[PDB]
Amino acid sequence: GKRLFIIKPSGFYDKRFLKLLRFYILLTGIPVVIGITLINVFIGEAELAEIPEGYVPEHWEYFKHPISRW
Amino acid sequence: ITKDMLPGPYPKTPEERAAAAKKYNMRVEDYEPYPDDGMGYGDYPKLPDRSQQERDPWYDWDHPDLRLNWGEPMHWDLDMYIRNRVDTSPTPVNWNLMCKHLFGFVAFMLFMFWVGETYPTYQPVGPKQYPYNNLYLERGGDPNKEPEPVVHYEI
Amino acid sequence: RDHWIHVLVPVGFVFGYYLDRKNDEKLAAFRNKSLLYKRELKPQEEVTWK
Amino acid sequence: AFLPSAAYLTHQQKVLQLYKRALRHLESRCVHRDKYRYFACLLRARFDEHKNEKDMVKATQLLREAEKEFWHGQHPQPYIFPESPGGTSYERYECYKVPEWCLDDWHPSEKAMYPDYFAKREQWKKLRRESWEREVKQLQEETPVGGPRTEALPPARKQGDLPPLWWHIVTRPRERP
Amino acid sequence: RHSIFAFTHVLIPVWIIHYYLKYHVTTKPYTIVEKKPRIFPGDTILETGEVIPPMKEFPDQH
Amino acid sequence: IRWTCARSANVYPNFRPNTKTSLLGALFGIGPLIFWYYVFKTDRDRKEKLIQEGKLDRTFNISY
Amino acid sequence: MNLFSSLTLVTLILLTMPIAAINFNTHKFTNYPLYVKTTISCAFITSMIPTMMFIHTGQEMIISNWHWLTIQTLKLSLSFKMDFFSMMFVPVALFVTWSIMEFSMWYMHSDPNINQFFKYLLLFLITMLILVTANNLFQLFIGWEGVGIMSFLLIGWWYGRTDANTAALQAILYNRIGDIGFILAMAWFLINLNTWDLQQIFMLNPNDSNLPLMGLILAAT
Amino acid sequence: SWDKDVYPEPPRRTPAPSPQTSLPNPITYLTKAFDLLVDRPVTLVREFIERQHAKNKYYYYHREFRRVPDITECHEKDVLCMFEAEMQWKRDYKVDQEIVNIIQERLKACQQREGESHRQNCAKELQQFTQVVKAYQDRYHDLGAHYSARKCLAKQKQRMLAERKATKEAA
Amino acid sequence: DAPPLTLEGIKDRVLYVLKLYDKIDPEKLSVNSHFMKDLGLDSLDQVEIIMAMEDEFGFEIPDIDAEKLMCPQEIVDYIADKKDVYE
Amino acid sequence: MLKYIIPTMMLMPLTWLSKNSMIWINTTLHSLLISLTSLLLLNQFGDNSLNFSLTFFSDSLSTPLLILTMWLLPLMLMASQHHLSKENLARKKLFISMLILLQLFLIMTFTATELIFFYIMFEATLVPTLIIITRWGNQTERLNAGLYFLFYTLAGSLPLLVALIYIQNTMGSLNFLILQYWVQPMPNSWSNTFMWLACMMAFMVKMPLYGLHLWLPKAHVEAPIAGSMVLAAILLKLGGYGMMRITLLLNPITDFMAYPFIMLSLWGMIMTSSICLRQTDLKSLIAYSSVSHMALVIVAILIQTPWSYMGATALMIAHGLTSSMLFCLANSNYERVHSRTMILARGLQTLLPLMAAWWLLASLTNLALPPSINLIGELFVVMSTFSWSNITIILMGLNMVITALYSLYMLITTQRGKHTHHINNILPSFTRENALMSLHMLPLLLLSLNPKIILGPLY
Amino acid sequence: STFVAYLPDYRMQEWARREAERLVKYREAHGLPLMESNCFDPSKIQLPED
Ligand SMILES: CCCCCCCCCCCCCCCCCC(=O)OC[C@H](COP(=O)([O-])OCC[N+](C)(C)C)OC(=O)CCCCCCCCCCCCCCCCC
Ligand SMILES: CCCCCCCCCCCCCCCCCC(=O)OC[C@H](COP(=O)([O-])OCC[N+](C)(C)C)OC(=O)CCCCCCCCCCCCCCCCC
Ligand SMILES: CCCCCCCCCCCCCCCCCC(=O)OC[C@H](COP(=O)([O-])OCC[N+](C)(C)C)OC(=O)CCCCCCCCCCCCCCCCC
């Protein structure tokens, strides 16, 4: 069907670089987002309460998110 | 590239002028430099100061996007004289006539706009009528101050 | 161990953190003495911060 | 004045180029076919009435008056063909004129995707690289002293020998890739 | 596979943005500030029950 | 390479300070600086003398 | 009351999904223009629903849904202002664009870079819809420069032809002069009204506001 | 939730939807579809996350700083107490900035929620915003990027001498 | 859009344009028939033919190449080279 | 700050004791470990700076600069690991040791609590850059590039040091945690005028100020690109740190004296933008753009408003990242074509698409496309300069046209048009190059989401 | 990115809301002004002579 050729520069290297970038960012992004939604669904975000009398808090007991506290 | 390939100082005598002309590989008489007024031009050839759209577009150039060949002594302002920049094409209309026409047109209708600003058009009507002292409270005025009661009268 | 050259910088960071933790000990001139952060030292405690 | 082969434009060539440009501007002036045909016949009859003039200086002055009225009576926006320079589609498809040597840079895992084409390319390259010394031998003895006097390339004078400097003029890709 | 577009590209964004807007944006004050609906004579507020009293009769001309 | 060398590196070695070059350098080097200095100066005194006397409206200007 | 904001943000996020779809591809996409066209048709329907709701009722909304920063007094947050204006203009633009991508499916079928072309005009539509529904002036500036850059790219599409490059640079120059006017108006509004949101600007109602109006006129020019 | 005094909002008055013509409207049907398909699974996953929240419920507390002697009772070139005074002054600076921010939030919310007649019903918010803007301009404006409690005290002193001079010259 | 043309298609086209010209008799024309030698026209008629071909194919031929191609076979060769036939 | 200095001084034997083929891998890995470790400096409070010890402190200002510095070292190591493959192994280790010493002196510069310590290591930084510029360049003019770079900067600061010593005889301490409370106002006199000049001119040269900017293009068109990136991205920021640490002591005489400096900076940034509009070399064009950006930063810190300080810090960090990645682009082009001419290699989008994408992103981030941090800083400086006076916006407005006009043009003639026929050595994208380009580009986009970490000491 | 996203309350900025959320809640319930033109106590300053 008169299938002609179009000369184009080799896109194998650019595609390989993009695949490597996406794989190497996803390899840690998937466990990080899985851990984030797991602590946000099971460990639980903290709650606001007033300071009790005679009991000082720790330096890490002033923040909301558990990751910030850790 | 060596010490006599890069451009040098101003050539004075015919012999060094011919040496500079064969340095740029052009005609000896057609190689003429800028006047030594102290601007630091040097022995660079002075092109007749035309743009690059004027070049032959059908000729098999060495560089087709620039219409420039190889080894030609190029313009002092090649960057200024690309197709994507200032163009010196021969216009069908005179340049001074173009400037005069544009200035006269712009000044004439700016003057007419200002004249119409002095004498405007309108409709044969009276002012609009609004209730409650021309909406004193709805304009944002304070309620602790009682406005002057102005009423609108029928006709 | 055939990877002795790869544990230079973590050892240096551990040594630097140990040096810093020794360094704030000499700066205990105003510990539990500031007019804004002062509090009574709790039982089963000896210092407010190490 | 500026030509790949010549250094001076003969007055006959200048007359023909004036006729071509003036009639193209006339066609761009009057759009319809009948008016264009009538005025084209009028212009051809005028050039025929001034055709029988063998005096060089008289045709010189007549050319000067003719160029002056042609520039005086030309359309500001003459019609330009879509592939001609100054046209709407001038060098538009040039973004896909990738040269052939980019196929040198291809990965070997993709060079096996089109095996016959790449084999043909390497045998073409072999043909070119064995013909290179023959063609530079052809120019090294046919060229006059002090370099060539004109830019017209010589042909191939022998059967089986490839044309000299044949590669980069025949290698340009199709205009619709 | 015929209705995979209308479920993945529509319904999951609705559920996600409604969860986010209901339990994370409405909890913050002055975030989704909505213009109050216009009140016309003869209407009735559902949350109170008080009826806006009827507007005076038109001095008709037509 | 000849043009790129003649554009930058071959300006000073074939430069001689005469009346034209020095006049052009003084005209285009210290002229606009003096003009902008004087314009911004008199704008500053006008703004300051407006703001010390309370005539400048600074009712809502609390971000600066 | 709750269908409104959810469906409108669904329209926006559904418009922004195919860009992330084409950015994370490992293969040649099978009929990417059909993907974009079907997505924009569903987005047109999803944005046509609150049009019917508003013309039935007459509701206007402000959705300040994501905080960005607080510097000194000023607070900037991701806020969408949807009134008669923006939320009425959006379905018209969605209909026109849906027809235009279908015509582009007809027209640009002979270009191997058709997917990049569709991605570019989808990005232009995204930043334009950001522009129309912007609440604070900064989001409107973001949409302004986004549509300017996308116009530059889509004019210099055929990068081989130098006339396209010259036209794109000329358009960039004139749009940057307009941005000079817009930035002057921005600076006057901040320096004299201590705000960038439209509500505070309309409430404070400055009197000697000839300079910001002149700047906005220059931006519109 | 949030406190209703710091963010006051008027009660909602929604008129009764009563059809005039016989043609039905799709808004009620789409509202029912939204309540069925969308709201129910969102409420289900919300009850899931809050039930998982109920097992581990620990608290965090708002930090409070006691009042310290200010910059006025500091001996000059004795850093050991003007450090605390400057610390308190910077904390109060941040608090005042957030106060002007919350007043701006109140004004914007009033202007949006009052519709097309906001120029009359948001007079109180405009007066409060003008008062707090004048207070902030007297308290903190023109200090410079290198602001300190000494510069603020000197500006307050200069303002006090200006006010006393205006009182004495118009007594 | 724009279907490729073979050499016999442009050959049919060029002989059609030649046969539609009044100065050419429709019997004595060939691919190698010289305009000044086989048929004996003028230079102006050659530029008329060049304009006819330019308007027929919808593209511009440069003036030097307009005057250089001097036979219908040269016209066929130039058109086939510029359109790059037999792909 | 001993938890980052000791890793650097302990990585020094690691690059001295490494094998003959694993120097680059070990140095890059351990420098990236230090780069991750450096994120602990963000323990910042809204009132008190993180004062580590007697001679080390780091407020909200210097922490982004430190993070930029020890994120910048691995990028320099990747960007300078191609052309040094034929260089001898001992000299390769010498080059890496010079880069490591430069990083160590830079991190010791930004955290020095005493101004004498800051000065001492701020021009202990002068030796490694001079060595790298003069030794590992590629032209003759590098020798001249070792003179104009040196004898400018020292000539600005050998007065300054004396002035600093005078403060040691006046206040009694040059510590910055003390001088925030012991500072006295500066009276109007000729002696205070010359003290202001001496305290200002060193970092005025190091920005550079217009008129004193001649050392910047002559030291950039010939450097090895590790030197080019450290000079453009982080070495110019020592002037900004000098401003934001020195201008506390120079009040209120700065307000009625910095008029000609602001005039020079504004009209010289106009001039250098115009010079960018008519350049032929990529390196010189990027250097003159850097001159324009630092003149803008000069105006921003000289008007001394809080909004201006936010904009100055944001513009400093964003311009450093953008100029470093632009120099990476120019180095890739000069690697492929073995020349610095702009008009030589054109139309590379037809051959290199991903480098064309990086060119487009670089040009977009150069002209302050929102919502990037470059636009944030530039906009804040624009509003602050409009607050200083009205007419300044005109002197900004033309620049904001011109700073777009070359920023695309420098792209276009390098990427768009008919490609050069007689150039055929254009290799495809090496993974190392594009990895370096993405490592430059992705933080610049990421910082737009959370700008509050790079908004100066008074956010 | 995960570290700087969950960084523990940069410069106490969120805290700057909460105490402010208390403070107006005080002074809108007792008729006190929102903020005063005097940053410090105007009765605890020795005014210089004029
Ligand atoms: C298809 C899969 C979909 C996802 C499925 C899984 C998730 C399901 C839904 C749950 C989501 C998570 C919980 C709700 C959201 C988080 C709640 C929360 O408090 O988040 C913290 C905050 C809420 O704001 P905030 O008020 O807490 O922020 C204050 C932050 N400080 C004080 C540090 C300044 O952030 C978000 O919620 C993130 C919003 C992300 C969406 C918006 C993207 C914007 C893109 C453009 C960026 C650039 C804009 C530049 C201009 C800006 C305007 C001027
Ligand atoms: C890049 C090249 C140009 C660099 C220019 C740098 C800035 C220009 C001014 C620098 C002056 C030198 C440092 C002075 C520091 C003074 C500190 C101070 O408190 O002074 C108050 C003191 C005041 O005296 P005092 O403090 O001893 O007196 C007691 C106080 N009273 C006055 C009340 C009694 O000033 C001086 O003593 C004189 C200061 C001016 C010095 C003039 C001579 C030097 C001129 C500039 C030379 C610059 C280098 C040129 C060559 C470059 C290389 C080729
Ligand atoms: C720093 C100075 C030196 C510079 C060089 C630094 C080198 C080292 C770099 C280390 C790694 C990077 C560190 C900085 C990371 C910054 C980013 C970050 O983490 O931000 C945190 C912020 C945190 O959000 P936040 O601040 O709102 O959250 C508040 C905090 N909590 C949750 C605890 C209440 O993350 C985000 O904002 C993410 C938002 C969601 C993700 C994006 C969704 C939208 C995506 C785009 C969709 C399409 C839009 C339209 C597009 C149109 C076309 C353009």
Side-chain angles (χ1 to χ4, degrees), chain A residues 13-15 17-18, chain J residues 351-359 429 434:
Chain A
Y13 299 99
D14 310 33
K15 186 250 296 194
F17 165 71
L18 282 192
Chain J
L351 317 171
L352 283 176
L354 216 38
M355 253 71 70
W358 295 126
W359 266 121
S429 161
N434 270 173

Side-chain angles (χ1 to χ4, degrees), chain B residues 80-97:
Chain B
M80 196 217 303
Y81 275 130
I82 53 172
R83 186 159 29 161
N84 317 338
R85 269 200 176 91
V86 185
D87 209 2
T88 326
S89 74
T91 57
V93 183
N94 306 140
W95 181 85
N96 283 257
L97 259 172

Side-chain angles (χ1 to χ4, degrees), chain E residues 12 16 19-20 24 28, chain G residues 66-68 76-78 136 138-139 142, chain J residues 371 449 452, chain K residues 13-14:
Chain E
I12 321 314
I16 290 321
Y19 179 33
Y20 166 63
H24 279 97
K28 283 137 195 165
Chain G
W66 183 45
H67 198 268
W68 199 42
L76 308 181
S77 167
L78 189 71
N136 40 4
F138 187 66
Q139 203 160 348
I142 284 167
Chain J
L449 311 164
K452 81 193 186 303
Chain K
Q13 160 179 352
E14 302 181 3

